[PDB]
């Protein structure tokens, strides 16, 4: 049954895309929150 | 009749295909909602 | 029903995100208030 | 989970930022309080 | 008539989906409003 | 003439589909509008 | 015309949401003004 | 209607938040007014 | 109108707040003037 | 002409929905603006 | 056209809110100015 | 316009405040001048 | 050509909406500035 | 030729269908834009 | 242009507020200077 | 060639539609900015 | 081009608003500074 | 009006102070005059 | 005019003290001149 | 401006105060000098 | 009411501070008047 | 530029206030010096 | 390639829009900063 | 061969259709982008 | 609820903060009062 | 091969469009950030 | 009333100083008159 | 200059006071010297 | 760049404001110091 | 798999953009805090 | 059979088209995401 | 990549605005501190 | 409360200061009276 | 700087004030000394 | 907790200033008191 | 982490600002206390 | 670094202001002490 | 810490003024006592 | 405590000044008494 | 230092006034002693 192997391949590819997207979004959100917190804490500390 | 047996086989195949489709939808929607909630809660927490 | 398991998985995942968000909220709010109270009391006492 | 690690990394980054803010505000607050006390006491003494 | 039962089953599935969505949205909205009110009342109290 | 009965039969049998479709839309739309207003008013109420 | 009944149901449903929102506003607003007036009048009285 | 219960939980939570806010503001205000009165009265007596 | 009750409720609290402020300010002012008059009238007579 | 009779039926139905929609908008918008004005005017007066 | 009626109702609600806000602000301003004038004239007279 | 009534009430209130301030200052000044003249004339006559 | 007529009708409705909006803005801004100036001049005079 | 008369008959039918379609669009577009501008101006009016 | 009329009305209201504030400040300053001069001249003559 | 006339007519027909759109956009935008500046300049002038 | 004309009209409206705001702020600032100078010089003269 | 009651409270207390000052000043002045007259008359007579 | 009455009362009190002091000084001077003249006359006559 | 009228009013009030002060000081100085000259001349003559 | 207890707690403390201040001022004044009377009566008697 | 005209008006008003203040202080100081010199020279002459 | 000319035309229109926006920004910011500096320096100088 | 001539004729027809379509898309997109940038720069400028 | 611990952590920290403020203000007041009494008593005694 | 040539042509066209879009985005972003920074720094400097 | 005890205690204290002052002056005066009478009686006898 | 006018006015008033004081002292000294020389010459003649 | 020209114009305007403020403050300071020195020297001269 | 290469290139571009953004934020925030601290410390020192 | 050759040729052509489409998707997505993050980071940084 | 050039240009522009803002703020702060110090020193010296 | 301890410490310090001041005033007054009595008695005795 | 010119104007004004005060004081002192010397010489020579 | 260290450093620094203030006041007070007795005792001794 | 370096640079700039502010305040306080002590000791010496 | 130059210019301006203040206070104090010593020595010598 | 150096500098300067004040008061008291003793001894010896 | 050291130092200095005060007075008194008996005894013996 | 020059100038002025006062007192004392000795010697001659 080729459909079985095709679905496994599609699910594996989707999981790989999920992993890469998670890495990218983690990097972007980390940068954004870092900048926001830096500005906020610098304004409040001074 | 062979037509009835073919119909039963097609119903079983359709159920199996719906099984893979449901699994793929679950994983993809889980990833999407996880990313959305991560961004939302991270932005609101800061 | 795969839908029943799917919705339950997202609800459990969302609860974890709320827990992580609440952990980050407390440390941020505690620092901001601690600085403001420190600046307010040191000016009143002096 | 990718999300669990990301939330913890942000909390560590936020906690690190609080340390810098406290160090900076202590230096700033000490200057304003010290000048206030210096001007107050130099006039009371005379 | 298969159409009657099919429509009724789809309507029941829709109602079940509405129930799950309502539970999830109540959880998320409760968390968000809790964080917002916590920040607001903490700022007003000090 | 069986033909005129056939045209009547489909038109008569059709109406139930519009009846059930209309009932299905109300519960689907009611959930969508219900969640939309719940998030809208709780956000402004806070 | 099920749509005529459906619109009336939504208008009745939306009216209830306004009732809950108004009850939530008055308790929150009263607490905000109550703290603000308490802080203002104690400073004036002293 | 799940929405009615959802609004009640938020209103109950909001009232709980108000009690904590009122309790906290009393302590902070009482300290500032106490210090203000202490410095004011010690100058008159001296 | 729900707002009409809210505005009347807030004004009722404000007048209640004013009474407490007036009660406290009389006690504080009376003490300050009494000490001031005691110091003034004692030095003049002695 | 079946089309001309049909077009009037849909056009008349469209006028009905606009009437019900306009009634719903007034209720929702009036509540939103009322709360916005209530929060704005209360803070200024206090 | 419902728009004109909605606008008129909104304007009436705004005027009523303005009236309540004016009453409250007159009360509060009168209280504060009375306290200030009392403490200034008592200081001057003695 | 409530502003005219508020200003008139405030001016009237300032008027009776001035009245009591004058009533108290007349008594205080009379007492002080009486003591001064008593001690001056007793010293001179004796 | 009915497109031009529709465009003109929408333009006229927009102009009417601008009229109502301008009336409401004048009322609200007048009330707010009146309250602000009343408080400012009252605090300055006393 | 019967053919040349036919297309004119269909063309004549095409003219009337467009006539009602244009009439239908204006009331729907007017309702959509009228509500959209109503929400915009009232929000900015406050 | 309703904006020009609004500006004119606001300027007129500001002028009336200026008049009321001037009257009140004249009364207050007159009373205070009268008390001060009464005390000074009574002390000097005695 | 009817194709050239058809495209030219459609291209020509788009010209005044842009004209009506541009005419309406200026009216709407001028209303929005006029209100926005009126609120901004009135607050700063006070 | 309509855009250039719209921009020029907006700039002209802004200039008129600036003129009105300048007149209002000159009036208000003159009044406040006159009151302050009156109080200061009246206190100094006595 | 609490202010009127407060003003008479101070004046009633201020009246008591004058009685206390007058009682003591007669004793002190009586002693000063008595010693002076004693020294004057014992020398002139002798 | 409170100043008129206060000054008149102060002048009347001053006149009363002047009268009492005049009586006392007449008594004292009479006694002193009498004893001195008595001593002188007895010394000379002998 | 009301400033000119206020300045004239306080100047006239001050002149009236000088009149009363001059009357009182003339009376007091006359009494004191009369007593002193009486005691000097009765001491010298005898 | 959270504020009703809060106001009373401050007033209860405020009265206590008055008791502490009145005890301290009596001690200070007793030395000031005692030293003044000691130097006054020693010089006269000696 | 309205700024130059506003500043010139403010400076002219300030200078006129200066003139009034000088006119008042001359009278007050003349009265004080006259009373002082009258008492001094009457004491020395007698 | 008409797209090249289209992109050039869009860039030119955007540049014209930037020019108009910059002119309007200069005017508005100049007016606002002028008002702010006028108020600040007028308050500081007096 | 008529086939080659037909292919060339339809190729030229397609080329001119692409030309007209390119012109239409250029003008429509230019209008849309002009309106969008007009609104954007007008909102940002004010 | 994470909010219950969050408010207690801040409220406990605020109570801790007041302790240092009360400790420092006693040290500051002790020096200011001590110097004031030292300069007062050495001047009176000498 | 027409296929590879067509694909390369589309790739080159996409690259050219990307370059032109990047240029336009650079212009728009530069203008917007320039205006934002101008307003921010002008407000902060003053 | 703390003031009642304070004045009464001081008046009692002043009485003690009067007693000591009266006691010491008799010793001093007795010496002065004693020596003067001693010298004058011996000179007249001798 | 107001200062110069005030200074010479005060100098003129001082000169008049000097003249009056000189006249009075001449009268008093004349009387005293006359009576003293009268007594001295009558005693010497005897 | 338009921004550089705008900054230069704002700086020039600020310098002009500084000049006006300097002139006004020189006038006011001269007046106040002249009055204070006049009082001081007329008090010292007598 | 071109997807992995595309994801890696996109993440690298994101990281480089983050670096440039961090540099820009550092510069801007440094300038802002520098201006704020300069104006704070200059105000405190004077 | 020619079937295998046809299938293999179609598969190879499909693979080549997939590769070309993948390259086109990579470049287009890279450009789009680059512009998106450029705008995001320039907006956040400012 | 145009992104690097765009970021560098934006950073250079931000540096230029920083320089202009620093110049303007130095000028304004210098003027304000000059006025403040002038008033303080002319009040102290005289 | 730390306020009670602070007040008690202040009162104890005041008592100590009173003791030292009493010692100094007794010794100084004793020396002064000794010198005065020495001079007086050596004058009278001889 | 205008500060140097203001300082020089204030110093010239002070020098003029000093000269006026010296003239007034020397006249007053000469008159006082002449009166004293006349009295002394009439007591001595006669 | 950085705050506990920060408060202790401020309290420790405040104690250091009190040491310098007490050292300086003793030197100043000793000079002023020493001069007063030098002038007091020299006049009494001689 | 560029944020750590940015925080360090900001703290260094703050330390430099503190040094400059300390120098300026030392100079200003030295001048003020020098003038005060000069005036006080000059008055005491004479 | 513009901050260093700004601070240096501010300190230089402060030093020049200190010099001017010293120049003025020397003259004022010299005049006051000259008048005081002139009066003292002319009263003692005569 | 510059504060300690500033305190030491002020103490040294204060010692310097104390030295000059002591020299001046020694000169003044020497001259005064010399004149008084000269007059006393010339009166006694002659 | 620094206060105890200061008071003892002042008392030690005060006792020190008394020693020189008694040293000088006996020298002056012995001279005045010595010259007095010298004039008394020689006249009586002769 | 300005203090050095000011103190030296004041000491020189004090010495000048001392010399002038010495000359005046020598003249006056010589005249008085001459008159008294002349009266004594002529009395002793007769």
Swiss-Prot record, chains A, B, C, D, E, F, G, H, I, J, K, L, M, N, O, P, Q, R, S, T, U, V, W, X, Y, Z, AA, AB, AC, AD, AE, AF, AG, AH, AI, AJ, AK, AL, AM, AN:
<keyword id="KW-0732">Signal</keyword>
<keyword id="KW-0812">Transmembrane</keyword>
<keyword id="KW-0167">Capsid protein</keyword>
<feature type="transmembrane region" description="Helical">
    <location>
        <begin position="21"/>
        <end position="41"/>
    </location>
</feature>
<dbReference type="GO" id="GO:0016020">
    <property type="term" value="C:membrane"/>
</dbReference>
<comment type="subunit">
    <text>Homomultimerizes. There are about 2,700 copies of this protein in the phage capsid.</text>
</comment>
<feature type="topological domain" description="Periplasmic">
    <location>
        <begin position="1"/>
        <end position="20"/>
    </location>
</feature>
<keyword id="KW-1133">Transmembrane helix</keyword>
<keyword id="KW-0472">Membrane</keyword>
<feature type="topological domain" description="Cytoplasmic">
    <location>
        <begin position="42"/>
        <end position="46"/>
    </location>
</feature>
<keyword id="KW-1032">Host cell membrane</keyword>
<keyword id="KW-1043">Host membrane</keyword>
<keyword id="KW-1139">Helical capsid protein</keyword>
<protein>
    <recommendedName>
        <fullName>Capsid protein G8P</fullName>
    </recommendedName>
</protein>
<dbReference type="GO" id="GO:0020002">
    <property type="term" value="C:host cell plasma membrane"/>
</dbReference>
<dbReference type="GO" id="GO:0019029">
    <property type="term" value="C:helical viral capsid"/>
</dbReference>
<keyword id="KW-1030">Host cell inner membrane</keyword>
<comment type="similarity">
    <text>Belongs to the inovirus capsid protein family.</text>
</comment>
<keyword id="KW-0946">Virion</keyword>
<comment type="function">
    <text>Self assembles to form a helical capsid wrapping up the viral genomic DNA. The capsid displays a filamentous structure with a length of 760-1950 nm and a width of 6-8 nm. The virion assembly and budding take place at the host inner membrane.</text>
</comment>
């Amino acid at each position: 049954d080729p459909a079985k192997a095709a679905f496994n391949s599609l699910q594996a590819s989707a999981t790989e895309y999920i992993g890469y997207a998670w890495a990218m979004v983690v990097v972007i959100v980390g940068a954004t929150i870092g900048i926001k917190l830096f500005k906020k804490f610098t304004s409040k500390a001074s």
